[PDB]
């Protein structure tokens, strides 16, 4: 990265944002390369401000009893909090002064006032004066707070961070990360502006004091009637604010839940996929969206009126307060368009800058204390020893994962364990499903307190789980995973965990980006990588939680005899196992049996025992009705108005006192009250909010309907954040941010184009004094938009790696805090702070460059108008500054809606985001006997690739057991996702003569049963986890649950079958889920079954449920097994093994095994015994 252009610069170039031009003529010619972004200002680095405000919040909390943050923030931003404010201020009070010459230098166009012709020459000055200091105080000051915002901002979401790499593991169950998500996202854009408001809580009544004083001296106390009438409608408007606030808590946690249930399967697609549920994912999407939509829909009805308030305060204002002064007195034209020039300044004032600044207040202290009680959470506990002879002792331990059971003291999870073990002993843990072998890990890792007991062990600690985490990059950086790399080290490692055989299958063979998950490889290279890189730390204690999971036989004997007993053997190493040889050569030996230790000993012992808008608009067909409706309304409004103005100038005392060389009022008049005229009543602005959220509805159901039927191949390139960025901030802003602003938009144009058309019929000079005025702020608009909207693209884009960051940190607390990395991924944050921050600040910098400029040329423009009226006005009736001066009165609201179509173009980017995922690519008896037929099948993952497999061709009978075996790696999973055509493939298979390309997709898939190797469980409760579609009622899921085994399991919670299941099932067993799988397979009746090893981790009592499940429930079923375990083998009629990229297949097992000498002695005595009988 290049330097920043604002660390060198100067002062007059500071003042006019001179230096963001070098990017802005270079964007308008082409496209913006890398090469083209700054580097941040170092003030604006994550480091610093996280520092400056952890030390203060720190010492709030250590000094003060009752600590706040907001406390902290005073003592680091007030005084150039205020330091801005004055300037702003400033800026205001000359808006309030201007009529006091603009109004002068207007009376002077009639020969009869004398007084004020004399004095015209130094009024205009006194007008450019002004105008040239307005525009010097208002946006220096606006992006000085502005740049406060972000700051704020950046140095609290550190803070967040930093907390959660501390929560205790207690409070994880009431956090997900759809709330810290919407955190996140909530804040993200709208805290940084909010700051260019606040101060409007004390400028706006010293404006109104003023204003009031000022408009005292024209209708002596006759004011106080316009000023009343100000504050009842401000007393509404306060009262619209507090019952907005109302709908808005009631719907935030139902998008959290929303949120949680759309990122569950889209990292699940594959398994949703097989399964056929798409039908009931989207109906439940849909469900959850529809009490969302009926709240989002009651607060826009009342920000509606909100925002129209304004435009009807005019009319009635200045009537009611000239009418008594006129009844009592008669009146002239001049007091009549000075009262309105007042009042309008008055209205901005009260009913559009004090109510924002309020809310704006109630906003920002909502989500301050949010993010103080988040800061206020409960800790993990890490108070223990750190020095010991690394004896591992553990005496009298009972712990409860329901803190409420544990805290009266609910069943005890586990009960009087204890045990030692010197430096360098294997102690292995041995049990049933259920018996709590994780749940002593984690005892011993400080993840679950016991309530009594001790354990004693020094603290260095390495750590491998049941199930295998990924972070995102390459496996070198998942290995050495934050410290030095050791060659010789990282080459042990890697050849004791037996990864040279797929590592040199690999492309770029050692540096595969991964993604987060890792789902670009099979399950037992995940599970070796997550041994390698605990192999590869250096401690004192070794804890292994079922690595030889998914691993066959050779593979494991191979790893377990040179990288356990041989590479690692002067250290203290405790493996939680199964298999009965492995108990062989362990020091010490501990049985569970649901709690209790059943046997504790040694083994000798237990022997003894754009078209962006066109799109948008023609999405929904009842928007171009509610538009030609306000068209219609418009055009018979314009009309009614041009010919009430012509009956004045043809018609001829009464309170108004009007004179010939005084009629040209009768426009200015008009001019300054056609926002009332033209202003859209509850007939059109109620309809017109309706059907604009009714789009959203539309297109996020298009998008959710368009993305999960997606081939894999493109859903593969896709990654979590950015799914959940466009699901989480761009559907937000859709529903939110677009129906007001559009409102405002065409609200405006109306007003311009109404006040232009209805002057240029009754004089045709206006308008072509209008039109270079017109012509110069087009041709800015279209300059900026060329680079805007590239930038304001890559602002959008750089969202992703927060969320990415924050999901993969969140999915891998554990292996963190045990490892000891939270310094690591604390500055891997940042770097993605600072990436999002680089090009938010230009994007910054560039609007505010734009809004000076568009100032600049009015004020231009304005003082080029003022010096020629003044000039030509000749002894009387100056014509010639009659008709600039009041084209100069139209310009001033075309210059506020220039800037509402800016920040329309900005929001559409949103509109063309989600417009992108609705145009991804599609990827489109009978089973009497379920005979197959497969010919001259190649399958491969990627267009133009290596192809897994090649020229696969096998025939099978109808019910017929089949064993599909092969090393780790070799495409048994590829095979099975081959069958339901989920990757790229050619050749055929034929079901029953039945060929693929006769019928559908969905049809097809239709005829099999599948057990996947990914167990997907959802948020809900079992009976939905079981059934979606709720075809089937509690007598048969009962009836199920008692043959599967999870009657016991069921009944544990406290909602039998009613119970919710959250974070995933993590209040199950990895057993459990295995059951869950199984019961789902059975339940929907199939023909053809394919089951991806079934029975993973089970030990060998649970492997008898799965066999006379196979035995009783799949009678007349063709099924294919692709089991690592021999025993499963003994049931199968026909064997096919895969092995170098190709498939070859078997009648007998005793013909299979003979062949592989090494293999067939890997095999255990027990399972030796019955294939060799
Ligand atoms: C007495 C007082 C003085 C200054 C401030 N603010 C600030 O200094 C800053 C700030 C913070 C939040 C904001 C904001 C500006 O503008 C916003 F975007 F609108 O939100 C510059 C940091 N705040 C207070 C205050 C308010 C409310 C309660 C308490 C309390 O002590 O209980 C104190
Ligand atoms: N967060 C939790 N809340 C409540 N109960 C839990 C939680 N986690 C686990 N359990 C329960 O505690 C018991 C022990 O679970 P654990 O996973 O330790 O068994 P296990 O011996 O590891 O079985 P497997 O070898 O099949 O994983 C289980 O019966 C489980 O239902
Ligand atoms: N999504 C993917 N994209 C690209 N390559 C993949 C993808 N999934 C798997 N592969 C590769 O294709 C090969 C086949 O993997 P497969 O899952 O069939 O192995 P496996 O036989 O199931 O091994 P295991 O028994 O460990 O599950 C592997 O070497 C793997 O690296
Ligand atoms: C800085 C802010 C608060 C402005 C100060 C507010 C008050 C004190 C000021 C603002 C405008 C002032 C008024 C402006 C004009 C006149 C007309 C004169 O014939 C009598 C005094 C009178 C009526 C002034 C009284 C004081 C006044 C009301
Ligand atoms: C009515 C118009 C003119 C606005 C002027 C009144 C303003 C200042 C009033 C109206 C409603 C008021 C709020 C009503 C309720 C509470 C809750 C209390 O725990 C703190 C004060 C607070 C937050 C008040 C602050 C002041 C408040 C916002
Ligand atoms: C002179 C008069 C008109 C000034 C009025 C100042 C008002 C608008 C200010 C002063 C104190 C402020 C409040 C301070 C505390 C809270 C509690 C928080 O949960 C919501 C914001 C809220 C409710 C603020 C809203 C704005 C507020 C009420
Ligand atoms: C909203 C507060 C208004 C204060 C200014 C009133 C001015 C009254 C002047 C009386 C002169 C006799
Ligand atoms: C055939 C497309 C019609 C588009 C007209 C929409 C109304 C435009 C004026 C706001
Ligand atoms: C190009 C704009 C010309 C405006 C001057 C109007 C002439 C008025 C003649 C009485
Ligand atoms: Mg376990
Ligand atoms: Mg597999």
């Known amino acids: 990265m290049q330097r920043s252009p604002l660390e060198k610069a100067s002062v007059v ?82 808006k309030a002064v201007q009529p006091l010459l603009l109004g002068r230098i207007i009376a002077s166009y009639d020969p009869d006032n004398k007084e004020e012709r004399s004095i015209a020459i130094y009024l205009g000055i006194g007008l450019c004066l002004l105008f040239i200091v307005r525009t010097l105080l208002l946006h220096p000051a606006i992006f000085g707070l502005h740049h406060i915002g972000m700051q704020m901002r950046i140095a609290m979401f550190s803070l967040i961070y930093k907390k959660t790499l501390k929560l205790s593991s207690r409070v994880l169950d009431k956090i997900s990360i759809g709330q810290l998500v919407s955190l996140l996202s909530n804040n993200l854009n709208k ?4 700051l260019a408001l606040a101060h409007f809580v004390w400028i706006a009544p010293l404006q109104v004091a003023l204003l009031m004083g000022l408009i005292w001296e024209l209708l002596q106390a006759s004011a106080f009637c316009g000023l009343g009438f100000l504050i009842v409608l401000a007393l509404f408007q306060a009262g619209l604010g507090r019952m907005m606030m109302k709908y808005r808590d009631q719907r935030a946690g139902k998008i959290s839940e929303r949120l949680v249930i759309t990122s569950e399967m889209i990292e699940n697609i594959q398994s949703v996929k097989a399964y056929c549920w798409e039908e009931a994912m989207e109906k439940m999407i849909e469900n959850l969206r529809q009490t969302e939509l009926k709240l989002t829909r009651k607060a826009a009805y009342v920000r509606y009126f909100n925002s129209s308030a304004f435009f009807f305060s005019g009319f009635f204002v200045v009537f009611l307060s000239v009418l008594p002064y006129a009844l009592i007195k008669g009146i002239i034209l001049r007091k009549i368009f000075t009262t309105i020039s007042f009042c309008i300044v008055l209205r901005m004032a009260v009913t559009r800058q004090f109510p924002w600044a309020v809310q704006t207040w109630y906003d920002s202290l909502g989500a301050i204390n949010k993010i103080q009680d988040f800061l206020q959470k409960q800790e993990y506990k890490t108070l223990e020893y750190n020095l010991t002879t690394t004896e591992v002792v553990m005496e009298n331990v009972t ?6 059971f544990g805290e009266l003291f609910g069943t005890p999870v586990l009960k009087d364990i204890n045990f030692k073990i010197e430096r360098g002993q294997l102690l292995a843990v041995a049990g049933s499903t259920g018996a709590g072998k994780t749940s002593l890990l984690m005892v011993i890792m400080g993840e679950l307190e016991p309530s009594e007991g001790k354990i004693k062990h020094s603290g260095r600690i390495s750590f491998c789980s049941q199930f295998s985490w990924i972070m995102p990059g390459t496996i070198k950086e998942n290995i050495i995973f934050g ?16 990864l040279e055989e797929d590592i040199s299958k690999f492309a770029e063979k050692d540096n595969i980006v991964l993604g987060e998950g890792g789902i670009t490889l099979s399950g037992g290279q995940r599970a070796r990588i997550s041994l390698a890189r605990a192999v590869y730390k250096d401690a004192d204690l070794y804890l292994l939680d079922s690595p030889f999971g998914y691993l066959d036989v050779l593979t494991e004997k191979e790893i377990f005899e040179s990288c356990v ?52 608009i023609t999405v929904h067909k009842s928007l171009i009705f509610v538009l030609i409706w306000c068209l219609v309304i418009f055009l018979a409004e314009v009309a009614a108005s041009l010919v009430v103005l012509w009956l004045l100038g043809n018609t001829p005392s009464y309170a108004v006192i009007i004179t010939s060389t005084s009629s040209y009022y009768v426009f200015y008049i008009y001019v300054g009250v056609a926002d009332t005229l033209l202003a859209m009543g509850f007939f059109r602005g109620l309809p017109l909010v309706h059907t604009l959220i009714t789009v959203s509805k539309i297109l996020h159901h298009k998008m959710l309907h368009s993305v999960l039927q997606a081939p894999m191949s493109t859903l593969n390139t896709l990654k979590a954040g950015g799914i959940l960025n466009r699901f989480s901030k761009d559907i937000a802003i859709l529903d939110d941010l677009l129906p007001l602003t559009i409102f405002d938009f065409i609200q405006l144009l109306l007003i311009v184009i109404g006040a232009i058309a209805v002057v240029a019929v009754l004089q045709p000079y206006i308008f072509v004094a209008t039109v270079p005025v017109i012509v110069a702020f087009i041709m800015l608009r279209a300059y900026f938009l060329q680079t805007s909207q590239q930038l304001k693209q890559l602002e959008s884009e750089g969202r992703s790696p927060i969320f990415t960051h924050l999901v993969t940190s969140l999915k891998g607390l554990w292996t963190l805090r045990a490892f000891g990395r939270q310094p690591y991924f604390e500055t891997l944050f940042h770097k993605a702070l600072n990436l999002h921050t680089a090009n938010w600040f230009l994007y910054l910098s560039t609007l505010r460059w734009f809004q000076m400029r568009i100032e600049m040329i009015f004020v231009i423009f304005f003082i080029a108008v003022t010096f020629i009226s003044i000039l030509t006005t000749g002894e009387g009736e100056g014509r010639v500054g009659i008709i600039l001066t009041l084209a100069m009165n139209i310009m001033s609201t075309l210059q506020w809606a220039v800037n509402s179509s800016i920040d329309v173009d900005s929001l559409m980017r949103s509109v063309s985001r989600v417009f992108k995922f609705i145009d991804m690519p599609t990827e489109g008896i009978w089973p009497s006997g379920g005979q197959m037929t497969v010919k001259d099948l190649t399958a491969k993952y990627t267009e133009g690739g290596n192809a897994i497999l090649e020229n696969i061709s096998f025939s099978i009978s109808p019910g017929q057991r089949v064993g599909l075996l092969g090393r780790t790696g070799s495409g048994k999973s590829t095979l099975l996702s081959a069958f339901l055509r989920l990757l790229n493939t050619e050749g055929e298979i034929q079901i029953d003569g039945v060929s693929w390309d006769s019928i559908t997709l969905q049809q097809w898939r239709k005829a099999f049963g599948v057990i996947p190797q990914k167990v997907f469980i959802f948020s809900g409760t079992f009976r939905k986890n079981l059934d979606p579609y709720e075809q089937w009622s509690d007598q048969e899921i009962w009836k199920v649950a008692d043959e599967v085994g999870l009657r016991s399991v069921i009944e544990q919670f406290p909602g039998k079958l009613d119970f919710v299941l959250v974070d995933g099932g993590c209040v199950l067993s990895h057993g459990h889920k295995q059951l869950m799988c199984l019961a789902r397979s059975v339940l929907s009746k199939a023909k053809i079954l394919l089951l991806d090893q079934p029975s993973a981790h089970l030990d060998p009592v649970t492997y008898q449920i799965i066999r006379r499940t196979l035995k009783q429930a799949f009678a007349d079923c063709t099924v294919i097994l692709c089991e690592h375990r021999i025993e499963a083998m003994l049931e199968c009629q026909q064997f096919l093994v895969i092995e170098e990229n190709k498939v070859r297949q078997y009648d007998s097992i005793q013909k299979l095994l003979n062949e592989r000498s090494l293999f067939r002695q890997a095999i255990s005595p027990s399972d030796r015994v019955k294939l060799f009988p």
């Open 483 to 498: 410290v030095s790399y050791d060659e010789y080290r990282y080459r042990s490692v890697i050849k004791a965990c037996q």
């Open 399 to 404: 712990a409860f994962w329901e803190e409420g």
């Open 13 to 94: 170039s500071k003042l006019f944002f001179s230096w963001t031009r070098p990017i802005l003529r270079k964007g308008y010619r082409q496209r913006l390369e890398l090469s083209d972004i700054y580097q941040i200002p170092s003030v604006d680095s994550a480091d610093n401000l996280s520092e400056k405000l952890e030390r203060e919040w720190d010492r709030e909390l250590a000094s003060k009893k009752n600590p706040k943050l907001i406390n902290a923030l005073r003592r680091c931003f007030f005084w150039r909090f205020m330091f801005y404010g004055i300037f702003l201020y400033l800026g205001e009070v000359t």
């Open 191 to 194: 805290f940084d502006e909010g």
């Open 565 to 616: 007993c041989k590479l690692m053997a002067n250290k203290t190493r405790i493996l939680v196992t199964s298999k009965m040889e492995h108990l062989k050569k362990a020091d010490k030996i501990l049985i569970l049996h649901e709690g209790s230790s059943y046997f504790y000993g040694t083994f000798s012992e237990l022997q003894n025992l754009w078209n962006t808008y066109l799109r948008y």
